[PDB]
Amino acid sequence: ALEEAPWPPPEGAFVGFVLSRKEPMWADLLALAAARGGRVHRAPEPYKALRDLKEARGLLAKDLSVLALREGLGLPPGDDPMLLAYLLDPSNTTPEGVARRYGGEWTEEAGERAALSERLFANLWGRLEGEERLLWLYREVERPLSAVLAHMEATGVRLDVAYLRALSLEVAEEIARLEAEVFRLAGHPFNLNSRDQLERVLFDELGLAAVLEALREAHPIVEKILQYRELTKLKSTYIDPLPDLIHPRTGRLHTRFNQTATATGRLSSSDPNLQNIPVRTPLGQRIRRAFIAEEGWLLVALDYSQIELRVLAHLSGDENLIRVFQEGRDIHTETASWMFGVPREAVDPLMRRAAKTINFGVLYGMSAHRLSQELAIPYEEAQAFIERYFQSFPKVRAWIEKTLEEGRRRGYVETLFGRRRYVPDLEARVKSVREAAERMAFNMPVQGTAADLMKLAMVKLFPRLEEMGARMLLQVHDELVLEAPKERAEAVARLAKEVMEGVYPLAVPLEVEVGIGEDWLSAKE
């Protein structure tokens, strides 16, 4: 046991806390404690207790910072063992998981959480001090980012409830129509949500899991059904819930951001989860339209153009790919031109399509077999096309090979900045497993770097942003969403563009599309 001591603790103490709910902005602070030396300090009354701390230092610091901010206190997030653990091995994503792996237990008791933080920090910090690159990431990117996220989560984003309500009825209507059609193609009404009734109808005149249904695209009814499922999912996952997630004390929505969740270092969101809102789908766009600016403010949305290809270009050092970007020429057009040995002027739109497909196909995994189906071209030609590609960008092939070799030898792969991911499976004899590792192997450096760049961008942008009355609100994919006063907008945009594009010196220029509007959808123009 440790020695009890009265509140407050000397500065530099590690904080432990317990919430009544997982969402910081909605939870009630039940317990608060601090540890330093061999002592523990338990706060008599949690809320007031916060004011005695100059820095939330410990496990899940950001979360506490959020609660404090909603209470009008500027309590900054400090060192957090989670970040260190994550940097050591991206597998470390939850506090319970980390504790177990490193000798501690995660309990629902403030004091204990306070002690655990101290212990962990010392332990992991030692292990990190020898890693030049990782220490850099922790200090220059990770830690500072905590503050940023804290503010984002706390400020939140305004929603157009009126619009949401309306949209709900529209989709409900489309659903009814689809349902009607299904009945027509079935000859008799029935419950689409009922397994038994569905199965019978299918077997009724057809010869037979969403995958199963997808494969059974033989009768139009199956198509229409899947559409029904889709709309239903979206309506209940994004349209209907949103209004209910508006915090009473702010009038805005507070989506959660996690810093140590994805396997590649990309930020993830929850409640909702922007990541899964349909990209360029009529409905998806309509949902984005719900996110609006404050009365007298505007939304500035910045997006990175094909960052992954530019990153690849840099990591491979492929003269051709590099030239495409340095020359500012259309990537897909040039790809086609190369693959088919035809000058720009004669690029058939179908060639462009093929190129576009391959380009993306080589990024996410190595879309080999998929090519046939997605292109409706015979097997042989598909392989040839792939060959033509690497023939045009040799160094990309060389890079992929090198990456895997290094992976097998060292046991891990790393992003441009040094972030690492261990890949033991590259030596697996089981096909599917080894192939999975292989995808991950080259996906990691490309995606990881894209993530790192964005994070670096944010970190160094925040201070300057705050200098003007501007706010950082959302981050999804390779996109940032800001909020700024009507008269300041244009200026803020100009700044954001520069900062982002010049975040780090690449052999390829970085480009950012910028849009300003009253709502997210309008902004993206």
PDB file of N, CA and C in Angstrom, residues 167-262:
ATOM      1  N   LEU A 167     -34.656  15.382 -43.666  1.00  0.00           N
ATOM      2  CA  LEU A 167     -33.953  14.315 -44.357  1.00  0.00           C
ATOM      3  C   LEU A 167     -34.439  12.938 -43.901  1.00  0.00           C
ATOM      4  N   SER A 168     -34.717  12.803 -42.612  1.00  0.00           N
ATOM      5  CA  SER A 168     -35.175  11.532 -42.073  1.00  0.00           C
ATOM      6  C   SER A 168     -36.406  11.042 -42.825  1.00  0.00           C
ATOM      7  N   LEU A 169     -37.396  11.920 -42.980  1.00  0.00           N
ATOM      8  CA  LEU A 169     -38.634  11.578 -43.688  1.00  0.00           C
ATOM      9  C   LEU A 169     -38.375  11.245 -45.164  1.00  0.00           C
ATOM     10  N   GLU A 170     -37.438  11.955 -45.788  1.00  0.00           N
ATOM     11  CA  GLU A 170     -37.117  11.699 -47.190  1.00  0.00           C
ATOM     12  C   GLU A 170     -36.612  10.274 -47.384  1.00  0.00           C
ATOM     13  N   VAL A 171     -35.640   9.881 -46.570  1.00  0.00           N
ATOM     14  CA  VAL A 171     -35.082   8.543 -46.674  1.00  0.00           C
ATOM     15  C   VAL A 171     -36.147   7.509 -46.350  1.00  0.00           C
ATOM     16  N   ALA A 172     -36.952   7.789 -45.327  1.00  0.00           N
ATOM     17  CA  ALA A 172     -38.025   6.882 -44.930  1.00  0.00           C
ATOM     18  C   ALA A 172     -38.931   6.625 -46.132  1.00  0.00           C
ATOM     19  N   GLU A 173     -39.170   7.675 -46.908  1.00  0.00           N
ATOM     20  CA  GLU A 173     -40.013   7.577 -48.088  1.00  0.00           C
ATOM     21  C   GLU A 173     -39.362   6.665 -49.122  1.00  0.00           C
ATOM     22  N   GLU A 174     -38.088   6.912 -49.417  1.00  0.00           N
ATOM     23  CA  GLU A 174     -37.377   6.099 -50.396  1.00  0.00           C
ATOM     24  C   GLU A 174     -37.433   4.645 -49.984  1.00  0.00           C
ATOM     25  N   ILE A 175     -37.317   4.403 -48.682  1.00  0.00           N
ATOM     26  CA  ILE A 175     -37.360   3.048 -48.148  1.00  0.00           C
ATOM     27  C   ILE A 175     -38.707   2.408 -48.464  1.00  0.00           C
ATOM     28  N   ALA A 176     -39.780   3.162 -48.244  1.00  0.00           N
ATOM     29  CA  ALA A 176     -41.122   2.671 -48.523  1.00  0.00           C
ATOM     30  C   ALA A 176     -41.207   2.276 -49.991  1.00  0.00           C
ATOM     31  N   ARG A 177     -40.722   3.146 -50.873  1.00  0.00           N
ATOM     32  CA  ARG A 177     -40.751   2.867 -52.304  1.00  0.00           C
ATOM     33  C   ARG A 177     -40.032   1.562 -52.602  1.00  0.00           C
ATOM     34  N   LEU A 178     -38.790   1.447 -52.139  1.00  0.00           N
ATOM     35  CA  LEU A 178     -38.008   0.238 -52.369  1.00  0.00           C
ATOM     36  C   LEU A 178     -38.788  -0.977 -51.896  1.00  0.00           C
ATOM     37  N   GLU A 179     -39.327  -0.872 -50.688  1.00  0.00           N
ATOM     38  CA  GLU A 179     -40.105  -1.941 -50.088  1.00  0.00           C
ATOM     39  C   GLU A 179     -41.264  -2.312 -51.009  1.00  0.00           C
ATOM     40  N   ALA A 180     -41.954  -1.298 -51.516  1.00  0.00           N
ATOM     41  CA  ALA A 180     -43.082  -1.508 -52.411  1.00  0.00           C
ATOM     42  C   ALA A 180     -42.625  -2.329 -53.609  1.00  0.00           C
ATOM     43  N   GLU A 181     -41.559  -1.875 -54.262  1.00  0.00           N
ATOM     44  CA  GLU A 181     -41.020  -2.573 -55.424  1.00  0.00           C
ATOM     45  C   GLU A 181     -40.746  -4.030 -55.096  1.00  0.00           C
ATOM     46  N   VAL A 182     -40.031  -4.267 -53.997  1.00  0.00           N
ATOM     47  CA  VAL A 182     -39.700  -5.626 -53.569  1.00  0.00           C
ATOM     48  C   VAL A 182     -40.956  -6.493 -53.529  1.00  0.00           C
ATOM     49  N   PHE A 183     -42.022  -5.960 -52.939  1.00  0.00           N
ATOM     50  CA  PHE A 183     -43.285  -6.678 -52.849  1.00  0.00           C
ATOM     51  C   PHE A 183     -43.795  -7.023 -54.241  1.00  0.00           C
ATOM     52  N   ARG A 184     -43.675  -6.066 -55.156  1.00  0.00           N
ATOM     53  CA  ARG A 184     -44.099  -6.245 -56.541  1.00  0.00           C
ATOM     54  C   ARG A 184     -43.320  -7.411 -57.150  1.00  0.00           C
ATOM     55  N   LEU A 185     -42.000  -7.387 -56.994  1.00  0.00           N
ATOM     56  CA  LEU A 185     -41.143  -8.445 -57.519  1.00  0.00           C
ATOM     57  C   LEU A 185     -41.264  -9.749 -56.735  1.00  0.00           C
ATOM     58  N   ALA A 186     -42.055  -9.743 -55.669  1.00  0.00           N
ATOM     59  CA  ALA A 186     -42.235 -10.935 -54.851  1.00  0.00           C
ATOM     60  C   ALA A 186     -43.631 -11.510 -55.034  1.00  0.00           C
ATOM     61  N   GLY A 187     -44.553 -10.666 -55.480  1.00  0.00           N
ATOM     62  CA  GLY A 187     -45.917 -11.107 -55.692  1.00  0.00           C
ATOM     63  C   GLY A 187     -46.755 -11.107 -54.430  1.00  0.00           C
ATOM     64  N   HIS A 188     -46.138 -10.824 -53.286  1.00  0.00           N
ATOM     65  CA  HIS A 188     -46.864 -10.801 -52.020  1.00  0.00           C
ATOM     66  C   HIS A 188     -46.040 -10.127 -50.939  1.00  0.00           C
ATOM     67  N   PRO A 189     -46.681  -9.311 -50.089  1.00  0.00           N
ATOM     68  CA  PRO A 189     -45.990  -8.609 -48.999  1.00  0.00           C
ATOM     69  C   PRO A 189     -45.381  -9.608 -48.013  1.00  0.00           C
ATOM     70  N   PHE A 190     -44.428  -9.136 -47.213  1.00  0.00           N
ATOM     71  CA  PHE A 190     -43.762  -9.947 -46.198  1.00  0.00           C
ATOM     72  C   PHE A 190     -42.789  -9.073 -45.415  1.00  0.00           C
ATOM     73  N   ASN A 191     -42.268  -9.591 -44.307  1.00  0.00           N
ATOM     74  CA  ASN A 191     -41.336  -8.832 -43.476  1.00  0.00           C
ATOM     75  C   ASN A 191     -39.888  -9.006 -43.936  1.00  0.00           C
ATOM     76  N   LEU A 192     -39.332  -7.963 -44.545  1.00  0.00           N
ATOM     77  CA  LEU A 192     -37.957  -8.010 -45.044  1.00  0.00           C
ATOM     78  C   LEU A 192     -36.926  -8.199 -43.934  1.00  0.00           C
ATOM     79  N   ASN A 193     -37.271  -7.773 -42.726  1.00  0.00           N
ATOM     80  CA  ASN A 193     -36.358  -7.883 -41.593  1.00  0.00           C
ATOM     81  C   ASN A 193     -36.445  -9.239 -40.908  1.00  0.00           C
ATOM     82  N   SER A 194     -37.355 -10.084 -41.382  1.00  0.00           N
ATOM     83  CA  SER A 194     -37.542 -11.409 -40.811  1.00  0.00           C
ATOM     84  C   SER A 194     -36.779 -12.458 -41.601  1.00  0.00           C
ATOM     85  N   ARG A 195     -35.802 -13.089 -40.958  1.00  0.00           N
ATOM     86  CA  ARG A 195     -34.995 -14.114 -41.611  1.00  0.00           C
ATOM     87  C   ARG A 195     -35.850 -15.199 -42.253  1.00  0.00           C
ATOM     88  N   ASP A 196     -36.693 -15.833 -41.447  1.00  0.00           N
ATOM     89  CA  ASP A 196     -37.557 -16.908 -41.923  1.00  0.00           C
ATOM     90  C   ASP A 196     -38.347 -16.540 -43.181  1.00  0.00           C
ATOM     91  N   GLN A 197     -39.094 -15.443 -43.114  1.00  0.00           N
ATOM     92  CA  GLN A 197     -39.898 -14.982 -44.241  1.00  0.00           C
ATOM     93  C   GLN A 197     -39.052 -14.650 -45.468  1.00  0.00           C
ATOM     94  N   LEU A 198     -37.877 -14.072 -45.246  1.00  0.00           N
ATOM     95  CA  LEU A 198     -36.987 -13.724 -46.346  1.00  0.00           C
ATOM     96  C   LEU A 198     -36.514 -14.996 -47.042  1.00  0.00           C
ATOM     97  N   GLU A 199     -35.882 -15.874 -46.267  1.00  0.00           N
ATOM     98  CA  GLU A 199     -35.359 -17.150 -46.750  1.00  0.00           C
ATOM     99  C   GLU A 199     -36.370 -17.870 -47.636  1.00  0.00           C
ATOM    100  N   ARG A 200     -37.576 -18.049 -47.112  1.00  0.00           N
ATOM    101  CA  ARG A 200     -38.641 -18.723 -47.837  1.00  0.00           C
ATOM    102  C   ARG A 200     -38.905 -18.057 -49.184  1.00  0.00           C
ATOM    103  N   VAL A 201     -39.025 -16.734 -49.191  1.00  0.00           N
ATOM    104  CA  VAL A 201     -39.278 -15.998 -50.425  1.00  0.00           C
ATOM    105  C   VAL A 201     -38.174 -16.244 -51.441  1.00  0.00           C
ATOM    106  N   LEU A 202     -36.931 -16.217 -50.980  1.00  0.00           N
ATOM    107  CA  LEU A 202     -35.795 -16.444 -51.860  1.00  0.00           C
ATOM    108  C   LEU A 202     -35.880 -17.835 -52.473  1.00  0.00           C
ATOM    109  N   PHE A 203     -35.906 -18.858 -51.622  1.00  0.00           N
ATOM    110  CA  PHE A 203     -35.995 -20.252 -52.066  1.00  0.00           C
ATOM    111  C   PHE A 203     -37.284 -20.520 -52.849  1.00  0.00           C
ATOM    112  N   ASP A 204     -38.290 -19.679 -52.625  1.00  0.00           N
ATOM    113  CA  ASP A 204     -39.591 -19.789 -53.281  1.00  0.00           C
ATOM    114  C   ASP A 204     -39.478 -19.890 -54.800  1.00  0.00           C
ATOM    115  N   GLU A 205     -38.621 -19.069 -55.400  1.00  0.00           N
ATOM    116  CA  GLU A 205     -38.453 -19.102 -56.848  1.00  0.00           C
ATOM    117  C   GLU A 205     -36.998 -18.961 -57.286  1.00  0.00           C
ATOM    118  N   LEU A 206     -36.082 -18.955 -56.325  1.00  0.00           N
ATOM    119  CA  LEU A 206     -34.667 -18.816 -56.640  1.00  0.00           C
ATOM    120  C   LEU A 206     -33.870 -20.001 -56.114  1.00  0.00           C
ATOM    121  N   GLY A 207     -32.764 -20.296 -56.785  1.00  0.00           N
ATOM    122  CA  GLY A 207     -31.922 -21.398 -56.369  1.00  0.00           C
ATOM    123  C   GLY A 207     -30.677 -20.884 -55.684  1.00  0.00           C
ATOM    124  N   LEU A 208     -30.661 -20.950 -54.360  1.00  0.00           N
ATOM    125  CA  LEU A 208     -29.511 -20.491 -53.596  1.00  0.00           C
ATOM    126  C   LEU A 208     -28.617 -21.666 -53.263  1.00  0.00           C
ATOM    127  N   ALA A 209     -26.289 -13.662 -44.656  1.00  0.00           N
ATOM    128  CA  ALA A 209     -25.006 -12.990 -44.811  1.00  0.00           C
ATOM    129  C   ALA A 209     -25.025 -12.061 -46.017  1.00  0.00           C
ATOM    130  N   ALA A 210     -24.720 -10.790 -45.778  1.00  0.00           N
ATOM    131  CA  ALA A 210     -24.692  -9.777 -46.831  1.00  0.00           C
ATOM    132  C   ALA A 210     -23.838 -10.227 -48.009  1.00  0.00           C
ATOM    133  N   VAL A 211     -22.753 -10.935 -47.713  1.00  0.00           N
ATOM    134  CA  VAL A 211     -21.856 -11.437 -48.748  1.00  0.00           C
ATOM    135  C   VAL A 211     -22.615 -12.406 -49.649  1.00  0.00           C
ATOM    136  N   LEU A 212     -23.347 -13.325 -49.024  1.00  0.00           N
ATOM    137  CA  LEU A 212     -24.131 -14.316 -49.751  1.00  0.00           C
ATOM    138  C   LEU A 212     -25.101 -13.600 -50.680  1.00  0.00           C
ATOM    139  N   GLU A 213     -25.846 -12.649 -50.124  1.00  0.00           N
ATOM    140  CA  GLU A 213     -26.811 -11.881 -50.897  1.00  0.00           C
ATOM    141  C   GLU A 213     -26.119 -11.165 -52.057  1.00  0.00           C
ATOM    142  N   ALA A 214     -25.004 -10.501 -51.761  1.00  0.00           N
ATOM    143  CA  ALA A 214     -24.238  -9.771 -52.767  1.00  0.00           C
ATOM    144  C   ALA A 214     -23.900 -10.676 -53.943  1.00  0.00           C
ATOM    145  N   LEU A 215     -23.470 -11.893 -53.632  1.00  0.00           N
ATOM    146  CA  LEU A 215     -23.112 -12.864 -54.652  1.00  0.00           C
ATOM    147  C   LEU A 215     -24.329 -13.278 -55.473  1.00  0.00           C
ATOM    148  N   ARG A 216     -25.489 -13.329 -54.827  1.00  0.00           N
ATOM    149  CA  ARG A 216     -26.720 -13.738 -55.492  1.00  0.00           C
ATOM    150  C   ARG A 216     -27.402 -12.660 -56.338  1.00  0.00           C
ATOM    151  N   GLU A 217     -26.620 -11.795 -56.973  1.00  0.00           N
ATOM    152  CA  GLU A 217     -27.186 -10.745 -57.817  1.00  0.00           C
ATOM    153  C   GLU A 217     -27.663 -11.351 -59.143  1.00  0.00           C
ATOM    154  N   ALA A 218     -28.751 -12.116 -59.076  1.00  0.00           N
ATOM    155  CA  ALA A 218     -29.325 -12.773 -60.248  1.00  0.00           C
ATOM    156  C   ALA A 218     -30.689 -12.186 -60.595  1.00  0.00           C
ATOM    157  N   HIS A 219     -31.494 -11.924 -59.571  1.00  0.00           N
ATOM    158  CA  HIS A 219     -32.823 -11.349 -59.754  1.00  0.00           C
ATOM    159  C   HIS A 219     -32.742  -9.931 -59.184  1.00  0.00           C
ATOM    160  N   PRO A 220     -33.336  -8.942 -59.875  1.00  0.00           N
ATOM    161  CA  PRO A 220     -33.308  -7.547 -59.414  1.00  0.00           C
ATOM    162  C   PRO A 220     -33.719  -7.344 -57.960  1.00  0.00           C
ATOM    163  N   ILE A 221     -34.590  -8.216 -57.464  1.00  0.00           N
ATOM    164  CA  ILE A 221     -35.060  -8.123 -56.090  1.00  0.00           C
ATOM    165  C   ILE A 221     -33.903  -8.083 -55.083  1.00  0.00           C
ATOM    166  N   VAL A 222     -32.882  -8.905 -55.307  1.00  0.00           N
ATOM    167  CA  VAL A 222     -31.735  -8.951 -54.403  1.00  0.00           C
ATOM    168  C   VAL A 222     -31.023  -7.603 -54.358  1.00  0.00           C
ATOM    169  N   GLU A 223     -30.903  -6.965 -55.518  1.00  0.00           N
ATOM    170  CA  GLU A 223     -30.257  -5.665 -55.608  1.00  0.00           C
ATOM    171  C   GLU A 223     -31.039  -4.690 -54.735  1.00  0.00           C
ATOM    172  N   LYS A 224     -32.329  -4.570 -55.027  1.00  0.00           N
ATOM    173  CA  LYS A 224     -33.205  -3.666 -54.296  1.00  0.00           C
ATOM    174  C   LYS A 224     -33.195  -3.915 -52.789  1.00  0.00           C
ATOM    175  N   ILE A 225     -33.126  -5.181 -52.390  1.00  0.00           N
ATOM    176  CA  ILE A 225     -33.096  -5.523 -50.975  1.00  0.00           C
ATOM    177  C   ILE A 225     -31.848  -4.940 -50.327  1.00  0.00           C
ATOM    178  N   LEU A 226     -30.686  -5.233 -50.901  1.00  0.00           N
ATOM    179  CA  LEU A 226     -29.428  -4.728 -50.363  1.00  0.00           C
ATOM    180  C   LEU A 226     -29.483  -3.214 -50.204  1.00  0.00           C
ATOM    181  N   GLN A 227     -30.101  -2.536 -51.168  1.00  0.00           N
ATOM    182  CA  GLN A 227     -30.234  -1.084 -51.102  1.00  0.00           C
ATOM    183  C   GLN A 227     -31.040  -0.738 -49.860  1.00  0.00           C
ATOM    184  N   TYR A 228     -32.114  -1.486 -49.637  1.00  0.00           N
ATOM    185  CA  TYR A 228     -32.974  -1.272 -48.480  1.00  0.00           C
ATOM    186  C   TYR A 228     -32.133  -1.368 -47.215  1.00  0.00           C
ATOM    187  N   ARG A 229     -31.389  -2.461 -47.080  1.00  0.00           N
ATOM    188  CA  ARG A 229     -30.539  -2.651 -45.915  1.00  0.00           C
ATOM    189  C   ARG A 229     -29.622  -1.449 -45.726  1.00  0.00           C
ATOM    190  N   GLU A 230     -28.996  -1.001 -46.811  1.00  0.00           N
ATOM    191  CA  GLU A 230     -28.091   0.143 -46.754  1.00  0.00           C
ATOM    192  C   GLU A 230     -28.757   1.379 -46.181  1.00  0.00           C
ATOM    193  N   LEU A 231     -29.818   1.839 -46.835  1.00  0.00           N
ATOM    194  CA  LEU A 231     -30.523   3.021 -46.367  1.00  0.00           C
ATOM    195  C   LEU A 231     -30.921   2.863 -44.906  1.00  0.00           C
ATOM    196  N   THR A 232     -31.520   1.722 -44.570  1.00  0.00           N
ATOM    197  CA  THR A 232     -31.944   1.442 -43.202  1.00  0.00           C
ATOM    198  C   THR A 232     -30.789   1.669 -42.227  1.00  0.00           C
ATOM    199  N   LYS A 233     -29.647   1.055 -42.527  1.00  0.00           N
ATOM    200  CA  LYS A 233     -28.456   1.174 -41.693  1.00  0.00           C
ATOM    201  C   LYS A 233     -28.097   2.646 -41.501  1.00  0.00           C
ATOM    202  N   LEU A 234     -27.886   3.351 -42.609  1.00  0.00           N
ATOM    203  CA  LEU A 234     -27.535   4.765 -42.556  1.00  0.00           C
ATOM    204  C   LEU A 234     -28.527   5.595 -41.755  1.00  0.00           C
ATOM    205  N   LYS A 235     -29.810   5.445 -42.050  1.00  0.00           N
ATOM    206  CA  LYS A 235     -30.834   6.209 -41.356  1.00  0.00           C
ATOM    207  C   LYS A 235     -30.750   6.026 -39.844  1.00  0.00           C
ATOM    208  N   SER A 236     -30.588   4.785 -39.401  1.00  0.00           N
ATOM    209  CA  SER A 236     -30.520   4.497 -37.975  1.00  0.00           C
ATOM    210  C   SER A 236     -29.152   4.732 -37.350  1.00  0.00           C
ATOM    211  N   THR A 237     -28.105   4.770 -38.168  1.00  0.00           N
ATOM    212  CA  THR A 237     -26.754   4.979 -37.658  1.00  0.00           C
ATOM    213  C   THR A 237     -26.286   6.429 -37.698  1.00  0.00           C
ATOM    214  N   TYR A 238     -26.767   7.198 -38.666  1.00  0.00           N
ATOM    215  CA  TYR A 238     -26.349   8.589 -38.791  1.00  0.00           C
ATOM    216  C   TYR A 238     -27.463   9.631 -38.747  1.00  0.00           C
ATOM    217  N   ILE A 239     -28.524   9.435 -39.517  1.00  0.00           N
ATOM    218  CA  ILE A 239     -29.608  10.412 -39.548  1.00  0.00           C
ATOM    219  C   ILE A 239     -30.395  10.579 -38.249  1.00  0.00           C
ATOM    220  N   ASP A 240     -31.044   9.516 -37.789  1.00  0.00           N
ATOM    221  CA  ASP A 240     -31.846   9.574 -36.568  1.00  0.00           C
ATOM    222  C   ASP A 240     -31.132   9.924 -35.248  1.00  0.00           C
ATOM    223  N   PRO A 241     -29.995   9.276 -34.950  1.00  0.00           N
ATOM    224  CA  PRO A 241     -29.267   9.548 -33.706  1.00  0.00           C
ATOM    225  C   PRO A 241     -28.690  10.946 -33.508  1.00  0.00           C
ATOM    226  N   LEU A 242     -28.072  11.499 -34.548  1.00  0.00           N
ATOM    227  CA  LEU A 242     -27.433  12.808 -34.441  1.00  0.00           C
ATOM    228  C   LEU A 242     -28.109  13.869 -33.583  1.00  0.00           C
ATOM    229  N   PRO A 243     -29.382  14.194 -33.847  1.00  0.00           N
ATOM    230  CA  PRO A 243     -30.048  15.218 -33.027  1.00  0.00           C
ATOM    231  C   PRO A 243     -29.980  14.930 -31.521  1.00  0.00           C
ATOM    232  N   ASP A 244     -30.086  13.656 -31.161  1.00  0.00           N
ATOM    233  CA  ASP A 244     -30.052  13.258 -29.762  1.00  0.00           C
ATOM    234  C   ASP A 244     -28.670  13.383 -29.119  1.00  0.00           C
ATOM    235  N   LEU A 245     -27.631  13.521 -29.935  1.00  0.00           N
ATOM    236  CA  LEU A 245     -26.270  13.633 -29.415  1.00  0.00           C
ATOM    237  C   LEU A 245     -25.809  15.071 -29.210  1.00  0.00           C
ATOM    238  N   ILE A 246     -26.736  16.017 -29.306  1.00  0.00           N
ATOM    239  CA  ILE A 246     -26.393  17.419 -29.120  1.00  0.00           C
ATOM    240  C   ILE A 246     -26.346  17.757 -27.642  1.00  0.00           C
ATOM    241  N   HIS A 247     -25.175  18.166 -27.167  1.00  0.00           N
ATOM    242  CA  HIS A 247     -25.011  18.511 -25.761  1.00  0.00           C
ATOM    243  C   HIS A 247     -25.825  19.751 -25.384  1.00  0.00           C
ATOM    244  N   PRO A 248     -26.602  19.668 -24.293  1.00  0.00           N
ATOM    245  CA  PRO A 248     -27.451  20.759 -23.799  1.00  0.00           C
ATOM    246  C   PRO A 248     -26.723  22.041 -23.402  1.00  0.00           C
ATOM    247  N   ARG A 249     -25.571  21.911 -22.754  1.00  0.00           N
ATOM    248  CA  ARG A 249     -24.813  23.084 -22.318  1.00  0.00           C
ATOM    249  C   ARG A 249     -24.030  23.784 -23.421  1.00  0.00           C
ATOM    250  N   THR A 250     -24.014  23.211 -24.621  1.00  0.00           N
ATOM    251  CA  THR A 250     -23.254  23.804 -25.719  1.00  0.00           C
ATOM    252  C   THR A 250     -24.055  24.016 -26.996  1.00  0.00           C
ATOM    253  N   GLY A 251     -25.044  23.158 -27.224  1.00  0.00           N
ATOM    254  CA  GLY A 251     -25.850  23.262 -28.429  1.00  0.00           C
ATOM    255  C   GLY A 251     -25.156  22.662 -29.639  1.00  0.00           C
ATOM    256  N   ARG A 252     -23.938  22.164 -29.434  1.00  0.00           N
ATOM    257  CA  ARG A 252     -23.139  21.563 -30.500  1.00  0.00           C
ATOM    258  C   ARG A 252     -22.921  20.065 -30.264  1.00  0.00           C
ATOM    259  N   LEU A 253     -22.469  19.368 -31.304  1.00  0.00           N
ATOM    260  CA  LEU A 253     -22.182  17.937 -31.251  1.00  0.00           C
ATOM    261  C   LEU A 253     -20.714  17.748 -30.880  1.00  0.00           C
ATOM    262  N   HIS A 254     -20.434  16.798 -29.996  1.00  0.00           N
ATOM    263  CA  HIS A 254     -19.064  16.555 -29.560  1.00  0.00           C
ATOM    264  C   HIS A 254     -18.629  15.137 -29.886  1.00  0.00           C
ATOM    265  N   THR A 255     -18.077  14.969 -31.084  1.00  0.00           N
ATOM    266  CA  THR A 255     -17.604  13.666 -31.527  1.00  0.00           C
ATOM    267  C   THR A 255     -16.257  13.390 -30.877  1.00  0.00           C
ATOM    268  N   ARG A 256     -16.048  12.143 -30.465  1.00  0.00           N
ATOM    269  CA  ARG A 256     -14.815  11.740 -29.802  1.00  0.00           C
ATOM    270  C   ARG A 256     -13.690  11.388 -30.774  1.00  0.00           C
ATOM    271  N   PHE A 257     -12.462  11.758 -30.420  1.00  0.00           N
ATOM    272  CA  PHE A 257     -11.289  11.474 -31.244  1.00  0.00           C
ATOM    273  C   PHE A 257     -10.304  10.629 -30.435  1.00  0.00           C
ATOM    274  N   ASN A 258      -9.774   9.571 -31.035  1.00  0.00           N
ATOM    275  CA  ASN A 258      -8.820   8.714 -30.343  1.00  0.00           C
ATOM    276  C   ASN A 258      -7.475   8.850 -31.035  1.00  0.00           C
ATOM    277  N   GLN A 259      -6.411   8.830 -30.248  1.00  0.00           N
ATOM    278  CA  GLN A 259      -5.053   9.003 -30.750  1.00  0.00           C
ATOM    279  C   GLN A 259      -4.258   7.695 -30.868  1.00  0.00           C
ATOM    280  N   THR A 260      -4.684   6.674 -30.130  1.00  0.00           N
ATOM    281  CA  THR A 260      -4.008   5.382 -30.121  1.00  0.00           C
ATOM    282  C   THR A 260      -4.991   4.253 -30.408  1.00  0.00           C
ATOM    283  N   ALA A 261      -5.608   4.269 -31.587  1.00  0.00           N
ATOM    284  CA  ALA A 261      -6.597   3.249 -31.933  1.00  0.00           C
ATOM    285  C   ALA A 261      -6.366   2.475 -33.228  1.00  0.00           C
ATOM    286  N   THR A 262      -5.939   3.160 -34.279  1.00  0.00           N
ATOM    287  CA  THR A 262      -5.726   2.485 -35.550  1.00  0.00           C
ATOM    288  C   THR A 262      -4.351   1.862 -35.617  1.00  0.00           C
TER     289      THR A 262
END
